[PDB]
Amino acid sequence: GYDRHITIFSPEGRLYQVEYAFKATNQTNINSLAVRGKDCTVVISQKKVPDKLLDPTTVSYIFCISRTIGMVVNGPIPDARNAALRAKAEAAEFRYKYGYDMPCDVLAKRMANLSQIYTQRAYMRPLGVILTFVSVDEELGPSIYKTDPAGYYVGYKATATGPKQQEITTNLENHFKKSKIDHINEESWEKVVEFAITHMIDALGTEFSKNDLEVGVATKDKFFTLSAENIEERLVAIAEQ
């Protein structure tokens, strides 16, 4: 039938058109992992550069929405830039009319509504990207919120994305069962980066380089990105543990 081609219910009450949107984020072979540190939130993610003729410095899956909130995207790159733009406009919007920078929580909720609106029309294609927003807020503390094509969102202790993300998830769950708290204790954010890399290497079974990773760090009142050199520093510190 044609309840699978436009976003109208079936005799099960299911929107098949929407479900397909999830099925496309595995096609770029990008994984991400994001954990809440002690005073930071770190997200490490794969960077695929299949050629020389692609310049690696430009291949970015990390878009700064706010000064304080980073966004890492898993899935097709057109929809990524589209989603980034909407989110940037809305963050600025709220700063203008409410006199402070938009909460991470409220931004996640916002994109969830817009996602629902793209599945409310019957000629609009859902934005298939899965979005991770990472922040350190001053009211909610360290935060991860992952929104999805359907327009469902929920908070997160930690999260992973990609075709191979079950393995990553298994690792993280076991860690927080030994530690019995919802965020990694350490006290130098640098060592939380190092820890995150170790779990990733275990999960995907591959050691990464400084151009197989791209790393984003949110500390208090800020988000920035590590350069490829900083990442190589971390991989020496794997030796040092």
Binding site: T25, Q27, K52, L53, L54, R81, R125
Partner: protein, 242 residues
Amino acid sequence: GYDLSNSVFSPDGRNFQVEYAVKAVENGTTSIGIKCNDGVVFAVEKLITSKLLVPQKNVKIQVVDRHIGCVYSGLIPDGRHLVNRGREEAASFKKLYKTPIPIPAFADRLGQYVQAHTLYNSVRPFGVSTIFGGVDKNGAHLYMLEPSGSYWGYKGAATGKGRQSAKAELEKLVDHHPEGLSAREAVKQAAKIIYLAHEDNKEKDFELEISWCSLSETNGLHKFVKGDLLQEAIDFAQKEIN
């Protein structure tokens, strides 16, 4: 099924209308772009379908701004319209911020635009890949834009029937200069690999066009290559393939 619009989606995770649009450019002209240190050098193969034409009158190289070169391949009317919109964008930025738009900024905006027409069944996508770049205060930049709305950083890029022939040579050219290379020398290069990508267009004949934006010669403006420099390049490429 799943081949009647651009807002169906398949269980495979694929949009075929959009993928199919890349094939449009695959039957287009060969066009290359060499990312340099000082700038960029574009070159485009112009097919000759008769000898009634007037060579270097049929433009595919349109300048957008006073410093961004744009040259496109695929369905021609479509690409001229894509450039049409981008000139409006250039003026708008200049009006509000009083400075010419940057190279990365222009790349961004075109990506949004090509996104829009694959999200509605009420507008038709484009059928072109465009190659554009220039010099700004962040350096030289080179970008290729798919009709899917995808772009990346590019050391070297190509598209058209002979995109394979072109790209194979660009790999070797990074072997020759792993430090990148000068714009002025890349003019001669640019001709070379269109002649090599005319071996996929070897039942036709061609006219070579070359355009450059480089900070070391033209003061960072996008200009054409013509006259004495042009014929030096034409002669170079000939002797090599002979």
